[PDB]
Every structure is written in structure tokens, then in C-alpha cells.
Coordinates of N, CA and C in Angstrom, one line a residue:
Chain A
X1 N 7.8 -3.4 -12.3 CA 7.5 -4.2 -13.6 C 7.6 -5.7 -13.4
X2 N 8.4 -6.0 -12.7 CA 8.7 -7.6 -12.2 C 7.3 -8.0 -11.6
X3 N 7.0 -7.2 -10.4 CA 5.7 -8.2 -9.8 C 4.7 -7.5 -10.2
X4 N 4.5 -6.5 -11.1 CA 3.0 -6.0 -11.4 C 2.3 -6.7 -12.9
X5 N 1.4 -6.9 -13.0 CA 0.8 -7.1 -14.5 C 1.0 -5.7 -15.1
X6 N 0.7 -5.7 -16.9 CA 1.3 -4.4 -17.6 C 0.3 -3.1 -17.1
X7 N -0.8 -3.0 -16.8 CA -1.8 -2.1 -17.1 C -1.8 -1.3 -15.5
X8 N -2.0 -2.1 -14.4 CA -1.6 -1.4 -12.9 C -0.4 -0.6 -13.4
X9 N 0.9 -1.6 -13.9 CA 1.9 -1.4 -13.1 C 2.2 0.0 -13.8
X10 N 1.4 0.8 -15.1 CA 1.3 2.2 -15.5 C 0.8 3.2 -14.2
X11 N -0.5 2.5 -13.9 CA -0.7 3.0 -12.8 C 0.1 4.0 -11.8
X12 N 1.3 3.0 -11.1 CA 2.1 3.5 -10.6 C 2.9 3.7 -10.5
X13 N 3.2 3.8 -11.8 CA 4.4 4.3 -12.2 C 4.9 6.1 -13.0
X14 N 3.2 5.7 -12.8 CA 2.1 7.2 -13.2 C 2.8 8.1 -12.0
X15 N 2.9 7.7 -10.9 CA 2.4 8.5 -9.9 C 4.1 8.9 -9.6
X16 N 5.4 7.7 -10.0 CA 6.7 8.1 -9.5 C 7.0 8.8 -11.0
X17 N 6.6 9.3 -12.0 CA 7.0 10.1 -12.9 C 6.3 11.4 -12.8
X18 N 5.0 11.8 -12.5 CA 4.5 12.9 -11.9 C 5.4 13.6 -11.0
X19 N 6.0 12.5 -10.0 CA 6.2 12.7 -8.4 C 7.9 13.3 -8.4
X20 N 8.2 13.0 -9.5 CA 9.9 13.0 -10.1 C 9.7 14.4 -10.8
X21 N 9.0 14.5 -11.7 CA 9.1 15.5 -12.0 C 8.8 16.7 -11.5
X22 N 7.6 16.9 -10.5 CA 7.6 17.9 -9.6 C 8.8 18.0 -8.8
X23 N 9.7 17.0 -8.7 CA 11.1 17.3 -8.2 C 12.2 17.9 -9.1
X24 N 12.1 17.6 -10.3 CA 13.0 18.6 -11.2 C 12.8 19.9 -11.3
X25 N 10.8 19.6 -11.3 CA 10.4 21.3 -12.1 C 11.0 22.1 -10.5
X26 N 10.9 21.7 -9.0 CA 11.0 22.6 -8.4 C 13.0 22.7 -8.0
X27 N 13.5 21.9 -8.6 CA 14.9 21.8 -9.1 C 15.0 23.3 -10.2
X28 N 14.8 23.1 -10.9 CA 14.8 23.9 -11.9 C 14.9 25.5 -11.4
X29 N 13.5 25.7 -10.9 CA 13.1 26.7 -10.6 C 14.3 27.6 -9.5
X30 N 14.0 26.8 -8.4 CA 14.8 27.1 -7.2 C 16.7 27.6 -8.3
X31 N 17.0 26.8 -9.3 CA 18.3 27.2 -10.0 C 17.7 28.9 -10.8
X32 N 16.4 28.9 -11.4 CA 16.1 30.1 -12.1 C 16.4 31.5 -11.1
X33 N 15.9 31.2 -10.1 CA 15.9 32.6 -9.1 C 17.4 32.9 -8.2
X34 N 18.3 31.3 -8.1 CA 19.2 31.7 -7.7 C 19.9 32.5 -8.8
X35 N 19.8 32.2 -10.1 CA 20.9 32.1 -11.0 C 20.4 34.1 -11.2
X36 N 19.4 34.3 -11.0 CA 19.2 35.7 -11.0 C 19.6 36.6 -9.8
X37 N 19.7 35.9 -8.9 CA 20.4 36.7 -7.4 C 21.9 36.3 -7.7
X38 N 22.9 35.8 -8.1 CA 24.0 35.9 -8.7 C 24.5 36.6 -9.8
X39 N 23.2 36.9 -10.9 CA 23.7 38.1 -11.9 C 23.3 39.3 -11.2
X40 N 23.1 39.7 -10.4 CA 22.4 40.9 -9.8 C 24.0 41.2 -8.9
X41 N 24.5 40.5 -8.6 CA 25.9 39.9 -7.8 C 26.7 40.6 -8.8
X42 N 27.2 39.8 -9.7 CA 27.8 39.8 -11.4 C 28.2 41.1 -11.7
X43 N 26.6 41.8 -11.7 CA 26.6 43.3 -12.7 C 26.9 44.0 -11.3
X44 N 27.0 44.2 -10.4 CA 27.6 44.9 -8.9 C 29.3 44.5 -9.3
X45 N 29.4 43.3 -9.5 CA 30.9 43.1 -9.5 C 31.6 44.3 -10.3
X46 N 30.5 43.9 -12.0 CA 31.7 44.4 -13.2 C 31.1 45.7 -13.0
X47 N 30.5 46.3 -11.9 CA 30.4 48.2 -11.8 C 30.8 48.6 -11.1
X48 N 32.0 47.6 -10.1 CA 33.1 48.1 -9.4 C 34.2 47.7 -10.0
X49 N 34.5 46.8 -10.6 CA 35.6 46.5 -11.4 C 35.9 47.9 -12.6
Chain B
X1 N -9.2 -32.4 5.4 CA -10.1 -31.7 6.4 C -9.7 -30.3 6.6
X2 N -10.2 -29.3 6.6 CA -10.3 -27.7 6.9 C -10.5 -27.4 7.8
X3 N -9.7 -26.0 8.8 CA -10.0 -25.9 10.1 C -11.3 -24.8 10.0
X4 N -11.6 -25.0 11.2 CA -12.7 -23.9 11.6 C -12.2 -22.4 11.6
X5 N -13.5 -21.6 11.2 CA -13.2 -19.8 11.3 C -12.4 -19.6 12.6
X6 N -13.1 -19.9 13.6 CA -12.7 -18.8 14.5 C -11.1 -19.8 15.0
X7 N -10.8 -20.7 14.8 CA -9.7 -21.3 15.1 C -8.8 -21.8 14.0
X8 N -8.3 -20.5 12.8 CA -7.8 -21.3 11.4 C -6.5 -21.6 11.4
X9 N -5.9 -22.6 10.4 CA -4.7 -23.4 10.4 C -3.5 -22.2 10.1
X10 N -2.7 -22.7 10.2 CA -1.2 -21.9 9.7 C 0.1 -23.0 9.4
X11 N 0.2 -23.0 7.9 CA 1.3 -23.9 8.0 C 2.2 -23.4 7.1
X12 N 3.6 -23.3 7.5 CA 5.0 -23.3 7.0 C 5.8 -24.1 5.6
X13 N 5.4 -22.9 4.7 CA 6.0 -23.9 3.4 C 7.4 -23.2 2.9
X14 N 8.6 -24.3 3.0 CA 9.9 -23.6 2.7 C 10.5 -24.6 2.3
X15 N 11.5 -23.9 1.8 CA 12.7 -25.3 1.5 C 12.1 -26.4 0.0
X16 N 11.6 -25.2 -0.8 CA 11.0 -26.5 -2.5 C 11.0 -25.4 -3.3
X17 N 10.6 -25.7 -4.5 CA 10.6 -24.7 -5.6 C 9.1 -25.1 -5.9
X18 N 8.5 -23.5 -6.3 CA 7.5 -23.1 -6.9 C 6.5 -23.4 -8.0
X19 N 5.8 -24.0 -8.3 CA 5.2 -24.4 -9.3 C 3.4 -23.7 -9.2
X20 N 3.1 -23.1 -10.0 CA 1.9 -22.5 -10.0 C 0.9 -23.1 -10.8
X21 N 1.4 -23.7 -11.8 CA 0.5 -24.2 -13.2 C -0.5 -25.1 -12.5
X22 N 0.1 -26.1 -11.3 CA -0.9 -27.3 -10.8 C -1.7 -26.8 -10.1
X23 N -2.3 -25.4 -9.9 CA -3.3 -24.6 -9.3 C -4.1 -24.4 -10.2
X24 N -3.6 -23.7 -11.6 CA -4.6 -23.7 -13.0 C -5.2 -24.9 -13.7
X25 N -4.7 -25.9 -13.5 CA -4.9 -26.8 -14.3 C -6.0 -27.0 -13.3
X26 N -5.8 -28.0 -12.5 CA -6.8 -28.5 -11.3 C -7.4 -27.6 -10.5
X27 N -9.1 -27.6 -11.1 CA -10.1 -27.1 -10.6 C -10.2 -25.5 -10.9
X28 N -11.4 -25.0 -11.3 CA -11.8 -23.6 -11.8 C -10.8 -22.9 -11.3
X29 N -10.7 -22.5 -9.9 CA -10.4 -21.8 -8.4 C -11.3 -20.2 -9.3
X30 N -12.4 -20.4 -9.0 CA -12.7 -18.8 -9.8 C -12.3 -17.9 -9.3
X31 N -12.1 -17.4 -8.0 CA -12.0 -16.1 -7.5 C -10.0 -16.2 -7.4
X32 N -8.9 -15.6 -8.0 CA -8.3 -15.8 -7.6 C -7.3 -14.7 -7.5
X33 N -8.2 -13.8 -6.6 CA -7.7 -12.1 -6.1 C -6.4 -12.2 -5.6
X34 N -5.3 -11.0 -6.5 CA -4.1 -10.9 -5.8 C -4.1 -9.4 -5.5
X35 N -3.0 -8.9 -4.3 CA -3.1 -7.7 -3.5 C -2.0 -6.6 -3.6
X36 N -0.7 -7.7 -4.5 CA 0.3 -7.0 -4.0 C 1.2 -7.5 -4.9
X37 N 0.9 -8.4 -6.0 CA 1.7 -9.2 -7.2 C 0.6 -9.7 -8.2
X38 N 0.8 -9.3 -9.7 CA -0.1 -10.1 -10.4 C 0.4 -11.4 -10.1
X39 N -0.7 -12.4 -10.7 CA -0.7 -13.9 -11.0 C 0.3 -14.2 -11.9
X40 N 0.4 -13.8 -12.8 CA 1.2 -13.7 -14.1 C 2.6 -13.7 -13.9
X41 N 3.2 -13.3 -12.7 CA 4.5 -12.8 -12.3 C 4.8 -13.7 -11.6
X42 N 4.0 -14.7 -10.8 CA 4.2 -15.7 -9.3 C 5.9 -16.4 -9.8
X43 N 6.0 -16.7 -11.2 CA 6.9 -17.5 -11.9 C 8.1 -17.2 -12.0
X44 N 8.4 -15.7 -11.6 CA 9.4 -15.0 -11.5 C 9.9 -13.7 -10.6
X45 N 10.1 -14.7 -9.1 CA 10.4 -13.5 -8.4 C 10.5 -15.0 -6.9
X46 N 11.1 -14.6 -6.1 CA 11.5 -15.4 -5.2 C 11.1 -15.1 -3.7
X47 N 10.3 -16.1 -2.9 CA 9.7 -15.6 -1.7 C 10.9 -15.5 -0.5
X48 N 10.8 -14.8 0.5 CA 11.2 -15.0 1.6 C 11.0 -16.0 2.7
X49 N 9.6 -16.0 3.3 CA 9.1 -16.6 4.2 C 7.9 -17.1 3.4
Chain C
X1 N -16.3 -3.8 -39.6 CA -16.5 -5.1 -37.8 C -16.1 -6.2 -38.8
X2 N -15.3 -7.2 -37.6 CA -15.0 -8.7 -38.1 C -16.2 -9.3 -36.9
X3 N -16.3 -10.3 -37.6 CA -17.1 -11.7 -36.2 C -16.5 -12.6 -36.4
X4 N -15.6 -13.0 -35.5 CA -15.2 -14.6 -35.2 C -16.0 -15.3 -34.3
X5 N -16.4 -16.8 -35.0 CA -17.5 -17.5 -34.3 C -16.6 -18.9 -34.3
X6 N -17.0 -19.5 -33.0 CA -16.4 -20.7 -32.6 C -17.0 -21.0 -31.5
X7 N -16.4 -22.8 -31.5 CA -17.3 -23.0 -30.1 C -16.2 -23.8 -29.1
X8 N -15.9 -23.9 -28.1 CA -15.0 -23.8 -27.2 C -15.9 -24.7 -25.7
X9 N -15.3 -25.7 -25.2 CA -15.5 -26.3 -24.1 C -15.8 -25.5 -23.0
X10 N -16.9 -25.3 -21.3 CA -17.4 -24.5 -21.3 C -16.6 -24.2 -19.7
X11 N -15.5 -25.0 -19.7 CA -14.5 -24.9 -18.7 C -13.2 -23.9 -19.0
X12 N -13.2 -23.2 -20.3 CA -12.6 -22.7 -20.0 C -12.8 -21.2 -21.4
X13 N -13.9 -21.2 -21.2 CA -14.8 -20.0 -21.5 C -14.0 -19.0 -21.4
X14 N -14.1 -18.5 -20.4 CA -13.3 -17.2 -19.9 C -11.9 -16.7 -20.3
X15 N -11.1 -17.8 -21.1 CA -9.6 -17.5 -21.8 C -10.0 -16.3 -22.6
X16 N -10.7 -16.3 -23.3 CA -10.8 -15.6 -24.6 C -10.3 -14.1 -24.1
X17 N -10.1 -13.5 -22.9 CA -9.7 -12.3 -23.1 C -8.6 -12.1 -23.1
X18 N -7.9 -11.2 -23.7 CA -6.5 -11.2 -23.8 C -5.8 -11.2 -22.3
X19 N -4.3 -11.6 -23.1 CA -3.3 -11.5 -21.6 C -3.6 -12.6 -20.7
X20 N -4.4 -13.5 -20.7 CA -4.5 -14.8 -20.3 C -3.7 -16.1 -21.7
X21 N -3.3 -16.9 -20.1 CA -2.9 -18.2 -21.0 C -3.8 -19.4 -20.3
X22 N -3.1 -20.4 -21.6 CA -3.7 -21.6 -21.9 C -3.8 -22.3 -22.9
X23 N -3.9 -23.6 -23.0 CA -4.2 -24.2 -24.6 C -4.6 -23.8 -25.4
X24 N -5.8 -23.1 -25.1 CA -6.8 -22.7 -26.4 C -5.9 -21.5 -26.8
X25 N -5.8 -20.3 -26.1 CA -5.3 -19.1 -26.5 C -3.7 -19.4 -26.9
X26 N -3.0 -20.0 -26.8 CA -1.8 -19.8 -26.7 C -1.4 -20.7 -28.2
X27 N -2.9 -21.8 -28.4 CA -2.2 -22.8 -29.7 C -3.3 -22.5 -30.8
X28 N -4.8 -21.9 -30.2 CA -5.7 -21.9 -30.9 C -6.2 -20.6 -31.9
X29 N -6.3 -19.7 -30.7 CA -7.0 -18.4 -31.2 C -6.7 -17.4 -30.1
X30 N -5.4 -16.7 -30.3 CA -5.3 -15.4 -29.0 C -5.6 -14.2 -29.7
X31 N -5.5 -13.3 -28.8 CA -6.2 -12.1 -28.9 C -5.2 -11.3 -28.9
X32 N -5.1 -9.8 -29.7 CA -3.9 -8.7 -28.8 C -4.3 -8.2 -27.5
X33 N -3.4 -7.7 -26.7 CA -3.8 -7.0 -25.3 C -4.2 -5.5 -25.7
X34 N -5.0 -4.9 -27.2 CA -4.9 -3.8 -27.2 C -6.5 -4.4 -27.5
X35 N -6.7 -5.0 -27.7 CA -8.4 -5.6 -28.4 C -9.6 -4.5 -28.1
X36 N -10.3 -3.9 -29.0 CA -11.4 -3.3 -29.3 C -12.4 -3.4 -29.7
X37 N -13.3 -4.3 -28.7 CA -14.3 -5.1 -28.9 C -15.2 -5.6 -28.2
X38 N -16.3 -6.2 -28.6 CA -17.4 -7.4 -27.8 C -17.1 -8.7 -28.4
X39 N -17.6 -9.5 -26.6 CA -17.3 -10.8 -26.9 C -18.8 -11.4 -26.3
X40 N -19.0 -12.6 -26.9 CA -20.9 -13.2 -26.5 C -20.6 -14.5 -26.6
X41 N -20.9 -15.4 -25.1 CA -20.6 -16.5 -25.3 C -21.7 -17.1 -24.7
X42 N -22.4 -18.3 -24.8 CA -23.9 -19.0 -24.7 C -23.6 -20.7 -24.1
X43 N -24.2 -21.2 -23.9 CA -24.5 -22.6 -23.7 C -25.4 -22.9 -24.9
X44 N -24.8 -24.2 -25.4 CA -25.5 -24.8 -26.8 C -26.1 -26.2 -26.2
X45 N -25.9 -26.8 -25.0 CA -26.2 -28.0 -24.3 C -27.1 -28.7 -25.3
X46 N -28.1 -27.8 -25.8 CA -28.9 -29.0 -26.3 C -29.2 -28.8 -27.7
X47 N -28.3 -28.4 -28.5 CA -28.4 -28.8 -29.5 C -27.1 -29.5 -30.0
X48 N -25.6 -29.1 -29.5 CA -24.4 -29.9 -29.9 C -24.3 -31.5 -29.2
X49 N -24.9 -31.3 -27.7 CA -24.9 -32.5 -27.0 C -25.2 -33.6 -28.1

């Protein structure tokens, strides 16, 4: 934002908020499937407990 | 005096502070493409070399 | 539609779009940077001369 004018500097800023978020969404995800291979874990526990 | 194409000048500017306005004021300069910083910003941000 | 009509020195014509400075725009007549519009500017040489 310092050295861009206002309308570029969307531009590319476009591209580190896209680029950020494909790193959460595949954050997320990667936590959705582990967090299901640990209740699969879980319910093994409490059906030997 | 201006140097020639195939043999062009290179000179070393350091050691002053920045002033851009005396480029706007004096003479059109119509074309005055930037690559890597708007114009608008020259006034805040500090060179290296 | 609005029409603003004015006549402006022919050196520095080209202010009128937003997000530029200068005397004219900055004490005379600026624009917003969201502006939705046409602009039409002419040589009068011979009839103001």
C-alpha cells in the first residue's frame, strides 16, 4: 500500500488474499479428515473401555 | 549535452533529499511510466542506491 | 446528468481526472476517485484569444 497507487495495489492484493485463503481452506480441510480418523480412534477407545 | 544510444551515461545520485514537485512543475514530461512504484508514493518511501 | 462547463489553460488539461494533483484540482474543481462519467475538452484559440 506504501509504494502502490489505490487501484493496482487491489490488484495484488487480490492475489495474497485468494492465495491465503486457499491456505486456510486446505488448513481446514486437512483438520476435517484428521479430526475424523481420531473419532474413529475415540469410539475404538470407549468400546474397549 | 545527452549521451549517445549505444554508449549511455550513468551517474550516481546520493547523499540529498528528494524532491519530485520540480519535475511536475517544469515542463509537460508527458510520458511518465512507472514499473514498480506509483508516482504518487515517490514522497514517501526512501531509496537505497 | 449534471454538465460542468469551464475553461482551463491548455497546459494542464489533463488534471481533470481524478486522483491527480495540482492547482486547479486541489483549489479549483476536484473530482471523487469513484467518478462516473464523460469528460470533452477542445481548443477555443480563436475565439477567446
Amino acid at each position: 500500500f506504501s509504494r502502490l497507487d489505490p487501484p493496482e495495489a487491489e490488484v495484488q492484493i487480490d492475489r495474497l488474499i485468494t492465495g491465503r485463503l486457499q491456505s486456510l481452506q486446505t488448513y481446514v480441510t486437512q483438520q476435517l479428515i484428521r479430526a475424523a480418523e481420531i473419532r474413529a480412534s475415540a469410539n475404538l477407545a470407549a468400546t474397549k473401555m | 549535452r545527452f549521451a549517445s544510444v549505444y554508449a549511455w551515461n550513468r551517474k550516481r545520485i546520493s547523499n540529498c533529499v528528494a524532491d519530485y514537485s520540480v519535475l511536475y512543475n517544469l515542463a509537460p514530461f508527458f510520458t511518465f511510466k512507472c514499473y514498480g512504484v506509483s508516482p504518487t508514493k515517490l514522497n514517501d518511501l526512501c531509496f537505497t542506491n | 446528468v449534471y454538465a460542468d462547463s469551464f475553461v482551463i489553460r491548455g497546459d494542464e488539461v489533463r488534471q481533470i481526472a481524478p486522483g491527480q494533483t495540482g492547482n486547479i484540482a486541489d483549489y479549483n474543481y476536484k473530482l471523487p476517485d469513484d467518478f462516473t462519467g464523460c469528460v470533452i475538452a477542445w481548443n477555443s484559440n480563436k475565439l477567446d484569444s
